[PDB]
Amino acid sequence: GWEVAVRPLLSASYSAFEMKELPQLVASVIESESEILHHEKQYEPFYSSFVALSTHYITTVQLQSVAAACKVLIEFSLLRLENPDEACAVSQKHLILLIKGLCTGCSRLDRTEIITFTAMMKSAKLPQTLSRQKEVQMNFLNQLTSVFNPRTVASAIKTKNVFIAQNVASLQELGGSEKLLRVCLNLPYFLRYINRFQ
Amino acid sequence: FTETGRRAILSLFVQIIQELSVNMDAQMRFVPLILARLLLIFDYLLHQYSKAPVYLFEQVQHNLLSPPTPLYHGFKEVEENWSKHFSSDAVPHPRFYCVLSPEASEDNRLDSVACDVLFSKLVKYDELYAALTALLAAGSQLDTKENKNVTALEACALQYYFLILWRILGILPPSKTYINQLSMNSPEMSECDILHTLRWSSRLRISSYVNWIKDHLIKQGMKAEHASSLLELASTSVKYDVEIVEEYFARQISSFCSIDCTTILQLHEIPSLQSIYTLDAAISKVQVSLDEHFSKMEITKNLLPATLQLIDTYASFTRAYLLQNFKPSKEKLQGFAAVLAIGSSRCKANTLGPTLVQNLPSSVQTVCESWNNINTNEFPNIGSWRNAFANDTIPSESYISAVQAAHLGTLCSQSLPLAASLKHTLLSLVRLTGDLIVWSDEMNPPQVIRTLLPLLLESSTESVAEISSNSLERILGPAESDEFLARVYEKLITGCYNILANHAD
Fold first, then answer.
1. Residue B432 near residue B440, CB atoms below 8 Å
2. Which residues are annotated with the PTM N6-acetyllysine (chain B)?
3. A56 close to A16: Cβ distance less than 8 angstroms
4. Which end of chain A is more exposed for a tag (fewer CB within 10 A), N or C?
5. How far is A77 from chain B, CA to nearest CA, in Å?
């Protein structure tokens, strides 16, 4: 179910993020991948807030799964920044800061917004209202299929560096540079300035 | 793999085990280290035939697929001996390892699909069980003659293999053929058969294994009506134990009676380790069963003579073992025997013993202290089966396992390996004799005294003379005013006369 999937975020909203709560969050993010990008209107704010909390708690701190989940979140934020729908729980600005924060050391989101995000979390209705061997085998298969770098690129700084390298590689893989430049060019307010310069 | 491949591999394992056991005679002299790995793999297959454990995934990830010590689940006690003999804190190469986690040490749930395959076509379970019972003697003749030392590797491999075989044999369900072989009579039984028989007869008594036995007997084609009657008539309890152990004692006495009189026995005629620990297990089981039977309270009318004959034969055995380790000529060997027959220092009655032992210059001093320093503490205590072993379902089986491990641990020694085994078996035998003499209405004084005084004043039996002293004190005299002191003095004069008359050269 999805209630048990969002349980770690609900528990951690009043504290830090427990280390034991990360791998199952990653597993849930990878498992629901086929559905996350395709949803109806009324579930959309719930999934947007869930993604916001998940990204926030990932950036505040096995590498292959984390990289895959971060790539998934970057893809989600990318097509959310391209389309953006009126009823998105997180506006385009916070998506931009989120994408930046995943590529940096998590100094963008503030408490004043995650309180509203958790309130929406509780007030939103579930897809399926909120108000050990399988995971190990999956990790084994993930490590087996592809080889992580590691050294091609004290402990905390190097882990952060490899995390940033993986995240920026994932962002570049989607070709997000062109999409971000396109979304920045056709702004509703800079359009007059661009026309005047032309 | 798929189910078909796994069952084919299991059938191939069955075929290998069945085929390899046909030439047991050659196997007596081999070192079963490859056999140990085969049995370990078979045990793992039996435990986890269907699923795959998580620790296997972690081990294969860390040891192989991670970028560049390995991680395994080796035996703690075997690796204890290996590291002790390796000394300088290196242990770089692991040679004795186990695949299954130690968490399965608790009573070891057999796989349903494994036994479903075992009780079906393409396998012959009866001959498989026969081969597994026969393979328990795959290293009996290794210790036997060339004066060649037994290295650490071979002793560790022997203990490792025996532990693996004992573990696997205690998990496989019964076969109907052996049930019939033991049901209404128990003939032509070998040492491995006896070793399996004691543990089984203790198992299917009170520990509620009988339901498991009949449940598995329903499989393989034996309906409940036959199984219940066979289980009922297989065990009815103390009489069965005394009968089987009396038969074993009679066979051992008949085997050893070919040697008589007072002659020095070579090392090669010393019994092998397997027979020694089989006898020790049998006597320990008898002691436990008799102790409980008369604690809760004519069957011992024939135990006494057989036990006394066992004791005096084993006293001759240990005396010969000590003597032949002293190239000395045979005449001065008999002279040394005459000196040490009246030796010993653990009895205060005699006075010459210590001085005559100590005045010999070098030959029988360093060897004497090295042999007398073999302390048998590692064995279970006197009544350790009553306090530390009664909490489990079967204290007797736990006692048997403990004494078996203690016997197996002695193979690592390089100076005097067998000494611990002979000392402990003599101690247990004399303690059983004392308990039985306490618990028997029939008692023949002359037999017991003329087989018991030689223990107290013998230098080769000093870790035991105290127990014999306590046993004789309560029945024959307070050792101070009664005729016991007179008999001790008489034996002293007999020894003095013999040494002064025969070996004056």
1. no
2. 239
3. no
4. C
5. 33
